[PDB]
Amino acid sequence: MVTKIIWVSNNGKPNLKIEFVSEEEKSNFFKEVKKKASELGLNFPLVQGSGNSLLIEASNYPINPCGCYISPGGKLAINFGKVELSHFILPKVGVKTEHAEIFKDHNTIFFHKHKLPGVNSELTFIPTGTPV
Numbered sequence: 001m002v003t004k005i006i007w008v009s010n011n012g013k014p015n016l017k018i019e020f021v022s023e024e025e026k027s028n029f030f031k032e033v034k035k036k037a038s039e040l041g042l043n044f045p046l047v048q049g050s051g052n053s054l055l056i057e058a059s060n061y062p063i064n065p066c067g068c069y070i071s072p073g074g075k076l077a078i079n080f081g082k083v084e085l086s087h088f089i090l091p092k093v094g095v096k097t098e099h100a101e102i103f104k105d106h107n108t109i110f111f112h113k114h115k116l117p118g119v120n121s122e123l124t125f126i127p128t129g130t131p132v
């Protein structure tokens with residue numbers, strides 16, 4: 001699974017750092033998402049972070065709408081270019097209504113301030129049904 005995501009800042013630009021339980025899940029996620037993106041004719045800025053992490057870089061609007069931006073309310077927002085890439089990525093990340101504003105035919109999600117308030121804020125996913 002995706003174990004954790006982070007709002008980071010890099011060269012004064014918002015990123016989403018995505019962490020994976022392992023290097024193999026990271027690599028596969030990288031190849032699958034990139035492929036789905038290019039099939040949809042999108043250049044989605046997902047790049048290598050580390051052994052077990054990737055980054056979604058900032059959007060370059062209006063030229064390249066794909067990537068992270070700060071919305072006028074100060075939320076981290078991620079434009080996925082097309083509704084189909086959103087549909088593809090979100091479940092694999094585990095991102096849901098409790099995490100973000102996600103809209104029917106929209107291509108952009110908005111993280112709740114009470115969930116990711118600012119730079120270096122973290123959301124950790126822990127597997128459901130696990131001993132507690």
Ligand SMILES: Nc1ncnc2c1ncn2[C@@H]1O[C@@H]2COP(=O)(O)O[C@H]2[C@H]1O
Pocket residue numbers: 059060061065066067068069070079107108
């Ligand atoms: N900096 C940006 N990066 C990516 N998309 C943006 C940016 N600014 C505006 N948009 C898009 O324009 C849309 C206008 O409506 P929304 O605020 O719902 O969502 C917005 C994003 O999809």
